[PDB]
Amino acid sequence: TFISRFAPDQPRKGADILVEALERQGVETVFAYPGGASMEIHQALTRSSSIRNVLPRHEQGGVFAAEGYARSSGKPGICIATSGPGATNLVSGLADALLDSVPLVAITGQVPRRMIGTDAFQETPIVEVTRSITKHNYLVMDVEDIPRIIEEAFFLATSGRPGPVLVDVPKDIQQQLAIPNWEQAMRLPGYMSRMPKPPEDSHLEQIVRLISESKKPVLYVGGGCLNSSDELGRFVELTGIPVASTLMGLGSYPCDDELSLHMLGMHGTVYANYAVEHSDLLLAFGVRFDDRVTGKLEAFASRAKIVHIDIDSAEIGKNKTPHVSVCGDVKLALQGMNKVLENRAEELKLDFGVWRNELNVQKQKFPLSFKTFGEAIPPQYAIKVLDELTDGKAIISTGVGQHQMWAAQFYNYKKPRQWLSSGGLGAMGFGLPAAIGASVANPDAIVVDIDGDGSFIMNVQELATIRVENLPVKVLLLNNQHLGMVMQWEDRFYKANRAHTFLGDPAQEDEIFPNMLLFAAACGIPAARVTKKADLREAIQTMLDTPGPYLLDVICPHQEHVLPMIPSGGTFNDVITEGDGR
């Protein structure tokens, strides 16, 4: 039973129909940059207290907060932008949630429907701009079918590969007064034809008929186990396969058990690449098999037999050819995998100690070491410092780049969605606004954050959102005055130059740029600035007890580079062995 804010037969502004239809899905936090054209929905918000406006400081910060609330809860996050230019700034985060497969909903105003696309004022035909980068768009032309498409949006947000749905409403639609006809069905006829049915064990038979055939398995898990809390851990409790977790799957397998292969691929852990490029059956639970993990299409575990479980039918065979393939919701089909294979628990193989012996001799022979050149803090140490101090579970946001994988390869994750990424979009500036939404998905819980020196700056505006919303974000700044990802891509691609990698001021290159203390002190937030390891455990000690938010500022050494890095279309033969910036 929905607690209706008003009468069920009140002909009112469509934003009232809209904002009730959000709470009728059961959502509680929006991100609503205010409306010179989406005006009524912020007005209809203010007559509600079940929904919360975390009003961002930028709409790209807003949609990344709508990312950050989505992929730190699993509830489909809702941004609201103003029409036109506000909606153009979603196009960042909508391109995140499609590539990162994140259930997002983007409500946005449009202009009057008598003025749509007329080269009008405050207009961007964003229903047609973001056609290529969302799961669905909407351009509703009546009040009576506003919650038709809204429940269809949250259908399309939850169902299939969970994508973003930009849902647009014209300004004169909410300024048109009509009655909410609530319970009408999903006008969604084609999507039910591939609304993915539960794949039964007869389809999973040729997985488990090949589990015993598998001598060298690997558990190539990723963003499809984003709902698998312990179901993947139950699966490895049943059969014991060494994992290979990607970035949206970092957390899914709690990466501190015996098969602790953190991240695989071209930038992963080199001993998980050894785990994946030596298998005879590449078992995959929810991965998109991209270029910067596979390297080559045909040589990425060429000696394996790919099985690949996805909710998305189109993903199956998209980047990588599968040997035998089965669709279906993984966490549902894992409950139809582990809770059915107990009849075969005395029948199945479990003979992977000779495969667990391969990783053990190559765990330490292929290590996760660093170079403490003097005392300039290895950030790869500083995240092993993090889980030494963050008391275990920590919901962590990241920007992207060299500092992205430093959280990946060097934090011991304990739960999916207690981790944020942009691996698909690879969005710089995603980090700190992802800490905004994570601090309302899991508000009281530890929302620690890390950001690079530019990606912190690239969305530094949403620092002001924190003090307004009292969020306890714990943001680290892995500063190196440098575009930290592509400076290694100078070296290992072509040349050891410094071609526009230097982010800092060349007049004060030895000094900090910019002064992130006086960033947080500008928005009144407490801050720090770290370069030495003695204060490193001290600063996080000051961080996790700080009331409300906290910033700090480690200094990454500007010439420190990460294994591995292959050119696109590569194998583990083409690994780099020790690449630095010196």
Partner: protein, 169 residues
Amino acid sequence: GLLTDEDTSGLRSHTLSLLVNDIPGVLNIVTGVFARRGYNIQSLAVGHAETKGISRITTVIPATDESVSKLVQQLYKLVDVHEVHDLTHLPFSERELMLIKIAVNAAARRDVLDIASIFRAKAVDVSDHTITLQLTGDLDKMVALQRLLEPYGICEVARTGRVALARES
């Protein structure tokens, strides 16, 4: 530069019979996928299917069936697509009208309509400035007429693109 060019097929040339809703922008959501999958669309012809309220797009894509399997399920990722049918590995009707205006004189108009009588082209409109044929059938009969009407004073060949249904026979 007057006439549309010769033929709309290569070697690969897969045909996909889309079946989408009658959304006002539903073409742009569908060829939006052909663009965003890096496919040239060699020919396309949309129209309203048997259930009035949905559409039907018949496309021609130069892609091998490995890449088409990266499209038929990828076109399923669209919301409005009810079904796609890779007709190219099936026997299928391939009929396409082709309105060919040809500028002719009086005596040459005799030596055009006979060719139009060969192809069962109903010469839909004639003047003294010109005659406009309208032939229909497979694309080989389309390209045969245009290969044979290039000797004559052709004008705007307003074609329509390959339209298909897989025959049961």
